[PDB]
Each structure stands twice: as C-alpha cells, then as structure tokens.
Design an enzyme around this catalytic site. Structure first.
Site, PDB file in Angstrom:
ATOM      1  N   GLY A 194       0.753  -1.242   0.022  1.00  0.00           N
ATOM      2  CA  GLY A 194       0.082  -0.068   0.012  1.00  0.00           C
ATOM      3  C   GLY A 194       0.945   1.221  -0.146  1.00  0.00           C
ATOM      4  N   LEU A 195       0.304   2.532   0.376  1.00  0.00           N
ATOM      5  CA  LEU A 195       0.838   3.517   0.451  1.00  0.00           C
ATOM      6  C   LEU A 195       1.436   4.136  -0.641  1.00  0.00           C
ATOM      7  CD1 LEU A 195       2.164   3.472   4.368  1.00  0.00           C
ATOM      8  CD2 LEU A 195       0.431   4.912   3.243  1.00  0.00           C
ATOM      9  N   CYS A 196       0.931   3.997  -1.696  1.00  0.00           N
ATOM     10  CA  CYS A 196       1.148   4.673  -3.138  1.00  0.00           C
ATOM     11  C   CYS A 196       0.329   5.671  -3.704  1.00  0.00           C
ATOM     12  CB  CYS A 196       1.619   3.333  -3.967  1.00  0.00           C
ATOM     13  SG  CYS A 196       0.106   2.143  -4.108  1.00  0.00           S
ATOM     14  N   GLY A 197      -0.797   5.979  -2.854  1.00  0.00           N
ATOM     15  CA  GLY A 197      -1.927   6.866  -3.424  1.00  0.00           C
ATOM     16  C   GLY A 197      -2.748   6.355  -4.666  1.00  0.00           C
TER      17      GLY A 197
END
Lengths: 48, 132, 127, 55, 119, 109
Positions: free
Chosen positions: F76-79
């Site tokens: 995750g944490l890629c927009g």
C-alpha cells in the site's frame, strides 16, 4: 513438431530448462547473474 | 542493406538498431542466413550460437538460450533472447558430466512427460559441447 | 586530546543517520558505513560498575576502535575483544603503559608500536 | 524548537502512548496478523509432536 | 547485581528488558508500514516479545474468584530457565495463546497440544 | 486540552515526522534503481509493438471467451495506483457482457 510435442510439453517449458541448462554451466565467478533472474519469487494461490 | 538489426535481452541490451550485415539464427528446422531482403518469418529459436557479421573487422560470438525472430515486411529483423550469454564465462569441467548424467537417468522415468524432458536436457547439453 | 578529536566527530555523524538504521539495506555505501563505524564506538564506551580505568589504558582501547581495527568483527564480539585486549597489554606490555603515563603525548615512536600490537593480536583472537 | 535541551523532545514508542487513531490502527493491525499465524502453527502441531517420537 | 543474584540471573533479566525496549521502536513503524512490510528478522523480535509479555503474566491465587483460573507459585530456578529458552528460540513454533496465564514453561506446551486437539 | 494531553499528542506527531522522512529516503533509492532498469526493457517492448505496425491486426467481430489481466504490487501507501487499475477494469466488463462474450479475469498481485 518435435518430440516435446505429442508428449505434453510446450515452448515455455522448453525455455525454462535450456535457460537453466545454460545458466548452470557458467563459471563460479558469474554465479550471481544466474541469481539475477531468480524466477522463484512469484507465488501461486488458487481460489479452491 | 537498410536493415535495423535489433537484438536484446531482459538484463542487458546487445547489438541494437544498428545496420549489421548478416545474422546467424539457431532454429529448429536449422540455421538460415539473413540476406538483405529476407522473407518475413516469425519462427522461434533453439539453443545455439549467433555469429553476427559486420564491417567492423571481424565477427562477434554470442549464445542464445531460447529466442524468437520477428522479421517484418520491410528490412527490419528483431531478435530476442532470454539468455544471450557470452561464451567465455562458461566452465567446461562441470559441463561435460551433465551430458552423461541425464542419459544415465533416462530409464528412471516411469512417466511419459519427463521422458521427453530428459531428451530435452541432453539436447540442450549437446548444444553447448559442440559449441565449446 | 589526540584520539577524541576523531571520535567525538564520528559519533556525531552517526546521530544524524541514526533513523535510517531500523529498516535499511537499500542505502548508499557511505550511509551504510556510518551505521557500521558508529555502532562499534558505542560498544567501546560500555563499562561495568566499580571499575575505573587508568588514563593511558583508555588511550589503548579507544585507539583500536577509531583507527579501523574493529570493523571486521561482530558487535557482540566487541565487548569481549576489549577485555581480551587489555589483559594482554597490561601483563605483556607494562613497559609501554608507563611511556604514556610519563611522556604524556603519543609520539610517532609509540604510534608505530601500537600498530604492531593490535594487528598482531587481531589475528590470534577469534577462537 | 528541538535543537536545544530546553526545547522539548519525544520518546521512543510514543505513538501508542497517546491513544489516538494511529495507536488503534496499530493495536488492531497486530492482531490481524498474529491471529492467522496462530493457525498455521496450530495445524502443524499434531505432525511435529509425532515427528519428535519418530526421531 | 552480578555479585548477589549471580551472573545467570543477571544476564537473563537484562535481556528481557532489552527486547521489550526493542519492541517499542518497532511499534511506531507498524502504525504506518503495517505488519506485512517488516523484514524477517524484525518479525522474529515482535513474536518473541509478545511471547515474553504474555509469559510475564501469571494467575494469582486470589484471582480464583475473578477469573476462574487456578493459581500458580513458580520457583526461582524454573523462572530463570523458562525465560532463557524463549530468548534462545526453543519455543518459536507455538501459538501465543499457550503462554497466557500459565506457570512453568512445561505448562505452556501442555496448552498448545490441547488447542491443536480441539481444532 | 490540558497540559498532559497536548504533550502526548505533540510527542506522537514528532515520531511520525521522523518515520515518514526516513521512508522517503528509502524509497528515493528504490526509484533511482527502478528508473535505471526500465530503459533496457524499453527496447524489449519496442519489438512487440513493431510487429503490429507493419501487420495491422484487430479483434474482428466477436469471441466466445475472454481474459482481463491487471498488474499491481502487494504494498500500500502509493496513492492512486491500485484504484487507477481496478476502476479501469470495471469500466470494461460493464462495457462487455452485453455483446455476449464470457469474461474471466486474473489479477497478479
């Protein structure tokens, strides 16, 4: 058509072996480039 | 003449986009020279060498594990390769014992799928020993 | 004064890169160096209760870490190596721990002699 | 106001010391991992115990 | 003090406290990166530290009216031996719910067999 | 809003400020390698596109079966990387399954 045909194998199965058969024949200086490929990263989980 | 010789690999790009004269293609149904208006054929490759001919003094030597040709309608052949290995990084000492190994394991195959596979393995291992 | 001027500076460069060390292997080789050298010098400064040291003995131990004779070791083997380096130099080299306690300054005639003690002990240690 | 001993600083492991919506997002994330390893491990126990007897 | 309690009691209780302060520096990473981003060494830390944290708990005899468990009274020679092995790795193959509310470490494997039989 | 509550909240965001500023320095190196590797494999996908320029092939009228493949990571944490692919995928199986063809998707990652 060849002997791999009418036997149950294919071309991608042919390409995995004659890659490794070349890649195992290397000297023990470029061994890490055989680890550069390292196809054993993707896993497979089935629905059932 | 007017032939963009494309040739690469996933690791490092080899002779690419350059006007080179003659290419050797190692292929089931033999090797065939690419002569400047060669007829388009999408055939895939077998293990063997590519000795590619240019005007730069002398030819180079490579080795393709399992490649594919797509020579197009115009004079543009594109060659691919999973392992376009250089020859000099190969060790002959461990390479010979593999050929006698797999033939010794031919009759240990109780199925019909692997019995073709060991026939594949000796053919790949016979491919290098004539080469070296 | 001679050895701590290289030591206070290099334990100060470790504090700026001290966040990267938790999840890091994809860094630059220079940043992976400050995580290396700075954690050996932290292991030297540990010290047991009720054991004061003589001054010229501390100039022996700190000379080993800050000069480069501890990078090829494991960090739980630093607090063993120091205790084995001291008991070898008290007994078999007592004449050179009174040539600093008298002269005061490490001359080059002693700076070349401790090079032949630490490297000639770093060989016959790991056993 | 952090480059001074007089200016206040933080501790280690203070996110779960507050009790916010990151301290909850982490207390539950650890149970959603270590509940499913607790039945990879649990299933293998019958076999492991047998194996000890074997060797 | 390594001169009153001995240099085996001392090396244990200064590794329990050192792995619990190693836990809190990882709990600030888990709150952003999540659990399945960590490396394989740091996952081993959190699992032992949660095994140690659950093993520090113990059912008292005066909680026989509050919880309904039965009470323990662990001797000192078993206390040092039990915690020495979780730090080593000799119980890395168990679930954490074995270690909650037991006495000696031999009761924490007699629970991981009952959980696997009633599965 | 007492003195303890302001401190513990302010101490928390001082932690989160360090972690995300380290995590940018980790992912600044991973992009800097993954910028390097793509330009070799840029000429690999030059060849398979060059097949279809000289020979213009299309899907003529109708098929009995179909595939949809969609790549991603597991992280995750890629927009807007993963929802820029799943919402594209649901924008085609609604567009299909009215011409009668059977669709079956596979998602790598």
């Amino acid at each position: 058509v060849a002997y791999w045909r009418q036997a149950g194998l294919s071309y991608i199965r042919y390409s995995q072996i004659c890659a490794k058969a070349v890649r195992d024949a290397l000297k023990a200086e470029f061994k890490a480039n055989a680890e550069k490929t390292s196809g054993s990263n993707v896993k497979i989980v089935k629905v059932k | 003449g007017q032939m963009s010789f494309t040739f690469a690999s996933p690791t490092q790009v080899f002779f690419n986009g350059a006007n080179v004269r003659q290419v050797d293609v190692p292929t089931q149904t033999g090797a065939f020279g690419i002569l400047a208006s060669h007829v388009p054929t999408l055939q895939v490759l077998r293990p063997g060498l590519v000795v590619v001919h240019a005007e730069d003094g002398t030819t180079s030597k490579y080795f393709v594990s399992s490649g594919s040709v797509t020579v197009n309608a115009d004079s543009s052949v594109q060659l691919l390769a999973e392992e376009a290995v250089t020859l000099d990084m190969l060790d002959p000492g461990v390479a010979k014992a593999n050929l006698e190994k797999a033939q010794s394991e031919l009759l240990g195959a109780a199925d019909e799928a692997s019995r073709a596979e060991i026939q594949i393995r000796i053919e790949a291992n016979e491919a290098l020993v004539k080469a070296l | 004064k001679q050895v701590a001027g290289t030591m206070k500076l290099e334990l100060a460069q470790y504090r700026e890169v001290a966040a990267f060390a938790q999840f890091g292997s994809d860094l630059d080789a220079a940043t992976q160096q400050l995580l290396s050298r700075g954690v050996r010098l932290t292991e030297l400064l540990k010290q047991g209760q009720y054991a004061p040291m003589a001054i010229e003995e501390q100039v022996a131990v700190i000379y080993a870490g800050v000069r480069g004779y501890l990078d090829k070791l494991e960090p739980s083997k630093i607090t063993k190596f120091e205790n084995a380096f001291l008991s070898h130099v008290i007994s078999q080299h007592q004449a050179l721990l009174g040539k600093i306690r008298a002269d005061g300054k490490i001359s080059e005639e002693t700076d070349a002699k401790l090079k032949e003690i630490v490297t000639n002990f770093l060989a016959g240690f790991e056993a | 106001s952090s480059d001074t001993p007089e200016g206040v600083r933080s501790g280690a492991g203070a996110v779960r010391d507050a009790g916010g919506a990151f301290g909850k997002k982490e207390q539950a994330d650890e149970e959603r991992y270590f509940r499913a390893r607790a039945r990879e491990q649990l299933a293998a126990l019958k076999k492991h115990h047998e194996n000890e007897i074997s060797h | 003090d390594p001169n009153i309690v001995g240099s085996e009691h001392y090396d244990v209780a200064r590794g329990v406290q050192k792995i619990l302060q190693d836990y809190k520096s990882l709990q600030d990473i888990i709150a952003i990166l999540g659990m399945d981003e960590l490396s394989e060494e740091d996952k081993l830390t959190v699992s032992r530290a949660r095994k140690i944290q659950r093993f520090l708990s113990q059912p008292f005899q005066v909680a026989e009216v509050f919880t309904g468990h039965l009470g323990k009274l662990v001797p000192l020679k078993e206390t040092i031996k039990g915690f020495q092995q979780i730090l080593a790795g000799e119980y890395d193959h168990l679930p954490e719910q074995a270690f909650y509310m037991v006495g000696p470490i031999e009761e924490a494997v007699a629970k991981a067999d009952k959980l696997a039989e009633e599965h | 809003a007492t003195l303890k509550d302001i401190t513990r909240r302010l101490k928390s965001i001082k932690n989160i400020q360090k972690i995300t500023k380290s995590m940018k320095m980790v992912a600044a190196a991973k992009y800097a390698r993954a910028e390097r590797d793509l330009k070799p494999a840029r000429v690999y996908g030059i060849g398979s596109l060059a097949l279809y320029e000289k020979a213009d092939i299309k899907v003529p009228e109708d098929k009995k079966k179909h595939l949809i493949i969609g790549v991603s990571s597991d992280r995750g944490l890629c927009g807007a990387i993963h929802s820029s692919v799943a919402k594209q995928i649901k924008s085609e199986v609604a567009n299909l399954t009215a011409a009668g063809k059977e669709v079956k998707i596979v998602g790598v990652g």
